[PDB]
């Protein structure tokens, strides 16, 4: 079954826009903008823990991703938790400064095949 598509409650103001709160929203959009890290964390957690997309961690990541993609429509921050950070990246990434771990998933096999073909 698919996940629920019900979004957050809309925020309605009691007064008209005075061109200041829109600037506040535009500046605050940079803060707590975790749209790009949720997908990376989900991929890392799927590659690490077997039986991926079955545990509650993947469901929480998907819900957070939906809430973050709803940020541009409704003013609801994603609120990315600290404990869900990957702190580890597979070989098929450009994060050379970050620690690299050898992945044994299907993506790891594909990357090894590509490396062997190029070499």
């Amino acid at each position: 079954p698919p996940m629920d598509y019900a979004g957050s409650r809309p925020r309605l103001m009691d007064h008209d826009v005075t061109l200041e709160e829109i600037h506040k929203f535009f500046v605050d959009y940079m803060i707590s903008d975790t749209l790009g890290v949720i997908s990376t964390a989900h991929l890392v957690h799927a590659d690490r823990d077997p039986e991926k997309a079955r545990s509650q961690k993947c469901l929480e990541l998907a819900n957070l991703h939906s809430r973050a993609v709803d940020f541009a429509k409704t003013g609801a921050p994603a609120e990315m938790p600290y404990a869900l950070k990957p702190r580890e990246f597979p070989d098929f990434l450009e994060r050379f400064e970050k620690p690299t771990y050898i992945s044994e998933s299907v993506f790891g096999k594909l990357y090894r095949a590509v490396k062997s073909s190029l070499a």
């Binding site: 957050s8 409650r9 925020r11 309605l12 103001m13 009691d14 007064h15 709160e21 609801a76 609120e79 990315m80 938790p81 600290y82 404990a83």
Partner: protein, 113 residues
Amino acid sequence: STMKFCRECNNILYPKEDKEQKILLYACRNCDHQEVADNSCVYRNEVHHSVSERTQILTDVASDPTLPRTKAVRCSKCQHREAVFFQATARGEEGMTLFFVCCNPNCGHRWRE
């Protein structure tokens, strides 16, 4: 609940209404003196709940209820399930929106719905 003393004999006055005069008047029963009223106010009391005097400390009347607590929600900064939820208005928004406060003594994090 107001009271005043007529300048003639310095005695309490009771309010009364006259159909012909169509105005508020005060006259005491001690002397036949009638004076004009001011502000047309005969009763003014601030509503208070101080009825059970010297009894609200022994028996818990529960004047200020405690906020409910839930364990279904999960905090973000810490992995604690207990949190306090309540409804309150925003700074400029309309309606009631749900809030959450973490119950972890070492977390101190609050977030909206």
